Design an enzyme around this catalytic site. Structure first.
Site, PDB file in Angstrom:
ATOM      1  N   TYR A  26       0.825  -1.196   0.000  1.00 58.13           N
ATOM      2  CA  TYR A  26       0.000   0.000   0.000  1.00 58.13           C
ATOM      3  C   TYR A  26       0.865   1.255   0.000  1.00 58.13           C
ATOM      4  O   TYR A  26       2.068   1.217   0.266  1.00 58.13           O
ATOM      5  CB  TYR A  26      -0.956   0.010   1.196  1.00 58.13           C
ATOM      6  CG  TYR A  26      -0.297   0.083   2.555  1.00 58.13           C
ATOM      7  CD1 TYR A  26       0.087  -1.070   3.222  1.00 58.13           C
ATOM      8  CD2 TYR A  26      -0.100   1.306   3.191  1.00 58.13           C
ATOM      9  CE1 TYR A  26       0.675  -1.007   4.472  1.00 58.13           C
ATOM     10  CE2 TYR A  26       0.494   1.375   4.429  1.00 58.13           C
ATOM     11  CZ  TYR A  26       0.878   0.218   5.068  1.00 58.13           C
ATOM     12  OH  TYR A  26       1.462   0.292   6.309  1.00 58.13           O
ATOM     13  N   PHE A  36       1.283  10.220   4.224  1.00 58.92           N
ATOM     14  CA  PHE A  36       1.216   9.932   5.644  1.00 58.92           C
ATOM     15  C   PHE A  36       1.564   8.495   5.964  1.00 58.92           C
ATOM     16  O   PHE A  36       1.785   8.187   7.137  1.00 58.92           O
ATOM     17  CB  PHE A  36      -0.180  10.257   6.203  1.00 58.92           C
ATOM     18  CG  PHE A  36      -1.281   9.404   5.642  1.00 58.92           C
ATOM     19  CD1 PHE A  36      -1.911   9.757   4.458  1.00 58.92           C
ATOM     20  CD2 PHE A  36      -1.722   8.275   6.320  1.00 58.92           C
ATOM     21  CE1 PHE A  36      -2.925   8.983   3.943  1.00 58.92           C
ATOM     22  CE2 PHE A  36      -2.732   7.498   5.812  1.00 58.92           C
ATOM     23  CZ  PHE A  36      -3.336   7.851   4.622  1.00 58.92           C
ATOM     24  N   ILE A  56      -9.160  -0.560   8.116  1.00 56.94           N
ATOM     25  CA  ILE A  56     -10.321   0.324   8.088  1.00 56.94           C
ATOM     26  C   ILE A  56     -11.312  -0.144   7.030  1.00 56.94           C
ATOM     27  O   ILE A  56     -10.977  -0.965   6.169  1.00 56.94           O
ATOM     28  CB  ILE A  56      -9.884   1.773   7.827  1.00 56.94           C
ATOM     29  CG1 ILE A  56      -9.116   1.842   6.509  1.00 56.94           C
ATOM     30  CG2 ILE A  56      -9.031   2.286   8.972  1.00 56.94           C
ATOM     31  CD1 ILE A  56      -8.773   3.233   6.069  1.00 56.94           C
TER      32      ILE A  56
END
Length: 107
Positions: A26, A36, A56
Site C-alpha cells: 500500500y 502519511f 479500516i
C-alpha cells in the site's frame, strides 16, 4: 464509498475471499496534502487476512474489488475510516483518503 480506478495489468479473476490472507504494497496519500503512510519504505509487504476488521472499512472493500497483480487507486470517504474521530496527530478529523494499492497476494 469505494471508488476503483484500475491501473490494468494482472488477471482480473483471482479475487480475495473469506479466510484468505493477502499481501499488499500500500501507499497512502492525503487529499491536497502530503504522504502519511507507506509500505514502500519499510519493504515489509503488510500481510493481512480478510474479514476480521483489521484494516479500516474503506480499505477493506477495495481489497476485495481487485485481483492478482492489479494496481488500483482507492478513494475513501470520511465516515468509513476516521472522519469524526481522526487518528491522533496523523489523520485529522474529517479527512478524505487516497491509497495507491497493489495486490500481490498468495492463497
Amino acid at each position: 464509498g469505494v471508488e476503483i480506478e484500475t491501473i490494468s495489468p494482472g488477471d482480473g479473476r483471482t479475487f480475495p475471499k473469506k479466510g484468505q490472507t493477502c499481501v499488499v504494497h500500500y501507499t497512502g496519500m492525503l487529499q491536497n496534502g502530503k504522504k502519511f503512510d507507506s509500505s514502500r519504505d519499510r519493504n515489509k509487504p503488510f500481510k493481512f487476512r480478510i474479514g476480521k476488521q483489521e484494516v479500516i472499512k474503506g480499505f477493506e472493500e477495495g481489497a476485495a474489488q481487485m485481483s492478482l497483480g492489479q494496481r488500483a487507486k482507492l478513494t475513501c470517504t470520511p465516515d468509513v475510516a476516521y472522519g469524526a474521530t481522526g487518528h491522533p496527530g496523523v489523520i485529522p478529523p474529517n479527512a478524505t483518503l487516497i491509497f495507491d494499492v497493489e495486490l500481490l497476494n498468495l492463497e
